[PDB]
């Protein structure tokens, strides 16, 4: 049986079970349960039908706390009924969420506060109190330290109640986060499934466990999130003998997803959206993990680096040809020029290269190494310096091609070492034109927050949303996770701070652009255990975030906070299209002339998204009939699957329609 209190707390009564307070003249299970709920310390109690007594820890019956979320779960909204509370003679009202805590630095902790009301009163008498916590077990009141200088998290915990002064957030300025979406496996890696008329599914994957990894295992846990309908499922992919944790990821011309190395460091898996199945690729010429791969102008996939797994040495380039179905080793694609200097040595130094497919089968490497390089696949491979981005390495910085037409790359954050490393606020616009000629680098305004292990996406208007990351790179921690998202506007070279997300998204988190021009932010954590099947019970679960949250940017909102009217792409052929061809589509529901941009479908892991890029379009209109001449350079318009967004003149985007660019 399950009893639900008047605020929504849940207890599970199992008649016939046994396992601080012992109350007699209790007639039933329900009564003992009501005793359990009275006591902030009570997770489990025993009803004794024989002696008619209730023990707060057959002849007996057990009572167990069983909320929809477990104790210690991060929340974005009160799980239970909230109350308002105004401090007498104050004209200052607070929301109170029972059975929850605010974790993080305290401005003050005060002993001998015996009621929630006295805790609210203390908050009212403390300058700059926006969040306080009442400790039901110890009779103490904590005032939380000021945000966003400090990061404060909202956790489900019966010991406490939270007290807050609501902040008015204008979504027309700051966007809006939805609530946490619980997932079966930590989304350490994710990709949009190509589909017509628009994608509806995000696949995501961890390792052999939903919240743990080891080494080679031959299995990956996947989740499948239909963001159209909210349906979620999971599967264990074993048929490719591939633990896909810590891989390279690239989308092929035909929208198949090439997942390369990681825990099974020499294994390759190909996801086919048409079948929803994985097939074995050919083994890589070199075993690799934590490498980046990029799809090229000719549909081949280049990769370099990957010392995380396989041999613990620098890894030269190689290239996959999906038509020959072959890997070729490229020793002339030398790892040495692209190394960082890391306190953990070569294991780290060749990891997570900022790689972009460009003109004539070239590769631009934008970082994270101080120096930028051109790589190529001709002969045995090529390498040359292109520019100096910065005076330090920015390992796991964010980076995105926000304007492929103008060769524009934005990068921000990262840390000089992979871990135990203060993150930078530095940001840069890199401009590329002719491959194997100098790049240009312009330092732009610093980020408002230092961020290691952040994520970034380009939006239809060319702005870049940076989500999560932490002030100091500390693998597998929540520590000083930034919750405030930042929007960088390349037109003004300005940052704006957005609404805060609920959960820190640091190491092993992702972000990715959804077809409604919202951003999924999720994941974080994972536990290392020595062997496949070992117990995770000794793992710090507070750093695991088997969930995500979706950000609506400012462009989705009118000045009054209502949802702005979106253009509708009412008709577009599902036929593939070549570079230089004319895309035509019908647009309804726009006042004045829409703009159009293509955004390549994303794939993401370890602060690496080598599949996304924005290709802005010029359109001409005859009535409701739009036409755009696609760039004729496959270095700009990479093959594969794209979102087509039509935006109002004020910058509100349509739901995307899928466009397939072919060779």
Binding residues for Na ion (CB under 5 A): 341, 416-417
What part of residues 479-518 is at the interface with ligand NAG (CB under 6 A)? none
Nearer to Na ion, 197 or 345 (CB): 345
Nearer to ligand NAG, 267 or 648 (CB): 267
**In the complex, least distance from residue 593 CB atom to Na ion, rounded to whole angstroms:** 49
The partner in contact with residue 416, picked from ligand NAG, Na ion, none with C-beta cut-offs of 5 to 8 angstroms by kind, is Na ion
Residue 343 assigned to a binding site: no
The partner in contact with residue 446, picked from Na ion, ligand NAG, none with C-beta cut-offs of 5 to 8 angstroms by kind, is none
**507 belongs to the catalytic site:** yes
Closest CA to 658 of 263, 223, 93, 201: 201
DSSP 415: B
β pairing state of 494-500 and 519-523: unpaired
Nearer to ligand NAG, 147 or 266 (CB): 266
Measured between alpha carbons, how far is 530 from 518 in angstroms, rounded to an integer? 38
Measured between alpha carbons, how far is 586 from 625 in angstroms, rounded to an integer? 5
**In the complex, least distance from residue 247 CB atom to ligand NAG, rounded to whole angstroms:** 14
* Under rule CB under 6 A, residue 321 binds ligand NAG: no
Residue 611 in contact with residue 257, Cβ under 8 Å?
Answer: no
Other residues' Cβ atoms within 10 Å of the Cβ of residue 352: 27
* Residues contacting residue 194 through CB under 8 Å, at least 6 positions apart: 251, 255, 273, 601, 640, 641, 658, 660
Nearer to ligand NAG, 214 or 267 (CB): 267
* Under rule CB under 6 A, residue 283 binds ligand NAG: yes
With CB under 6 A, what is the number of residues at the site for ligand NAG? 3
Other residues' Cβ atoms within 10 Å of the Cβ of residue 661: 23
Q: Which residue among the candidates 47, 320, 402, 507 is catalytic per the annotation?
A: 507
Residue 145 in contact with residue 154, Cβ under 8 Å?
Answer: no
Stated as kind and residue range, the H or E segment containing 488 is strand 484-489
What part of residues 249-268 is at the interface with ligand NAG (CB under 6 A)? 266-267
**Exposed (0-12), middle (13-18) or buried (19+): which is 263, by Cβ within 10 Å?**
buried
**In the complex, least distance from residue 266 CB atom to ligand NAG, rounded to whole angstroms:** 4
Backbone dihedral angles phi then psi of residue 338, each to the nearest 5 degrees: -95, 0
The partner in contact with residue 147, picked from Na ion, ligand NAG, none with C-beta cut-offs of 5 to 8 angstroms by kind, is none
DSSP 461: T
The partner in contact with residue 83, picked from Na ion, ligand NAG, none with C-beta cut-offs of 5 to 8 angstroms by kind, is none
Residue 102 assigned to a binding site: no
DSSP 307: B
Nearer to ligand NAG, 319 or 510 (CB): 319
Other residues' Cβ atoms within 10 Å of the Cβ of residue 397: 31
Residue 606 assigned to a binding site: yes
The partner in contact with residue 266, picked from Na ion, ligand NAG, none with C-beta cut-offs of 5 to 8 angstroms by kind, is ligand NAG
Q: Across the strands, what pairs with 86? A: 93
Other residues' Cβ atoms within 10 Å of the Cβ of residue 10: 15
* Residues contacting residue 91 through CB under 8 Å, at least 6 positions apart: none
* Under rule CB under 6 A, residue 147 binds ligand NAG: no
**In the complex, least distance from residue 215 CB atom to ligand NAG, rounded to whole angstroms:** 12
Nearer to Na ion, 150 or 341 (CB): 341
Residue 136 assigned to a binding site: no
Residue nearest to ligand NAG (CB): 283
**In the complex, least distance from residue 370 CB atom to Na ion, rounded to whole angstroms:** 10
Q: Across the strands, what pairs with 60? A: 48
3-state secondary structure of 643: strand
Measured between alpha carbons, how far is 638 from 358 in angstroms, rounded to an integer? 8
Closest CA to 152 of 621, 391, 638, 503: 503
The partner in contact with residue 283, picked from ligand NAG, Na ion, none with C-beta cut-offs of 5 to 8 angstroms by kind, is ligand NAG
The partner in contact with residue 586, picked from ligand NAG, Na ion, none with C-beta cut-offs of 5 to 8 angstroms by kind, is none
Other residues' Cβ atoms within 10 Å of the Cβ of residue 2: 9
**In the complex, least distance from residue 528 CB atom to ligand NAG, rounded to whole angstroms:** 21
Nearer to Na ion, 289 or 414 (CB): 414
**In the complex, least distance from residue 310 CB atom to ligand NAG, rounded to whole angstroms:** 9
Annotated catalytic residues are: 507
Q: Which residues sit in the known binding site for Cu(2+)?
A: 290, 507-508, 606
Residues contributing to the site for ligand NAG (CB under 6 A)? 266-267, 283
């Amino acid at each position: 049986t399950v009893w639900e209190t008047p605020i929504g707390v849940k207890y599970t009564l199992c008649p016939g079970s046994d396992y601080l307070q012992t109350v007699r003249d209790i007639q039933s299970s329900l009564e003992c349960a009501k005793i359990c709920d009275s006591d902030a310390r009570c997770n489990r109690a025993v009803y004794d039908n024989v002696n008619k007594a209730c023990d707060v820890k057959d002849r007996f019956e057990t009572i167990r706390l069983t909320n929809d979320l477990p104790e210690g779960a991060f929340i974005s909204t009160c799980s239970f009924n909230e109350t308002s509370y105004r401090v007498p003679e104050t004209n200052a009202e607070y929301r109170i969420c029972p059975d929850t805590d605010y974790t993080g630095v305290n401005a003050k902790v005060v002993e001998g506060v015996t009621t929630i009301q006295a805790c609210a009163e203390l908050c009212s008498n403390t300058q700059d109190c926006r969040k306080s916590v009442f400790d039901h077990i110890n009779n103490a009141c904590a005032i939380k330290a000021a945000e966003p200088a400090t990061s404060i998290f909202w956790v489900q915990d019966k010991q406490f109640s939270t007290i807050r002064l609501p902040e008015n957030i204008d979504p027309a300025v700051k966007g809006k986060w939805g609530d946490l979406i619980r997932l079966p496996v930590i989304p350490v890696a994710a990709y949009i499934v190509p589909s017509y008329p628009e994608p509806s599914r995000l696949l995501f994957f961890s390792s052999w466990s939903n919240d743990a990894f080891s080494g080679a295992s031959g299995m990956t846990q996947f989740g499948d999130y239909d963001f159209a309908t909210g349906a979620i499922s999971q599967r264990t992919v074993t048929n490719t003998h591939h633990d896909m944790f810590c891989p390279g990821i690239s989308q092929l011309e035909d929208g198949r997803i090439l997942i390369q190395g990681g825990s099974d460091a020499d294994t390759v898996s190909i996801y086919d959206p048409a079948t929803n199945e994985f097939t074995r690729g050919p083994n890589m010429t070199l075993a690799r993990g934590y490498q980046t791969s990029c799809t090229l102008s000719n549909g081949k996939v280049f990769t370099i680096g990957g010392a995380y797994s396989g041999e613990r040495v620098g890894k030269n380039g190689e290239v996959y040809d999906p038509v020959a179905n072959a890997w070729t080793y490229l020793p002339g694609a030398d790892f040495r020029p692209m190394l960082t200097n890391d306190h953990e040595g070569i294991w780290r130094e060749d990891n997570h290269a900022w790689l972009f497919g460009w003109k004539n089968g070239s590769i631009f490497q934008a970082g994270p190494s101080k120096d930028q390089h051109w790589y190529g696949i001709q002969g045995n491979g090529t390498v040359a310096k292109a520019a100096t981005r910065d005076d330090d390495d920015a390992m796991c910085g964010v980076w995105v091609m926000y304007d492929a037409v103008a060769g524009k790359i934005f990068s921000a954050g990262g840390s000089p070492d992979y871990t135990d490393s203060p993150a930078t606020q530095r940001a840069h616009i890199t401009t590329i034109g002719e491959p194997n000629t100098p790049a240009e680098v312009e330092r732009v305004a610093d980020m408002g927050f230092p961020r290691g292990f952040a994520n970034a996406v380009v939006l239809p208007d060319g702005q870049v949303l940076v989500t999560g990351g932490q002030r100091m790179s500390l693998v597998f921690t929540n520590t000083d996770g930034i919750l405030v998202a930042e929007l960088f506007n390349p037109e003004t070279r300005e940052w704006k701070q957005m609404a805060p997300m609920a959960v820190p998204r640091n190491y092993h988190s992702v972000s990715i652009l959804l077809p409604d021009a919202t951003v999924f932010s999720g994941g974080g954590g994972m536990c290392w255990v020595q062997n496949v099947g070992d117990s995770t019970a000794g793992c710090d679960k507070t750093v695991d975030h088997s969930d995500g949250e979706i950000f609506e940017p400012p462009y989705l909102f009118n000045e009054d906070g209502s949802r702005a009217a979106r253009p509708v792409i009412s008709a577009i052929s599902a036929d593939p299209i070549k570079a230089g061809a004319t895309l035509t589509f019908t647009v309804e529901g726009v006042e004045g002339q829409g703009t159009a941009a293509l955004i390549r479908l994303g794939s993401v892991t370890h602060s690496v998204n080598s599949d996304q890029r924005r290709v802005p379009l010029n359109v001409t209109v005859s009535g409701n009939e739009y036409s755009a001449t696609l760039p004729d350079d496959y270095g700009i318009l990479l093959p594969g699957y794209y979102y087509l967004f039509v935006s109002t003149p004020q910058g509100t985007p349509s739901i995307a329609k899928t466009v397939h660019v072919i060779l």
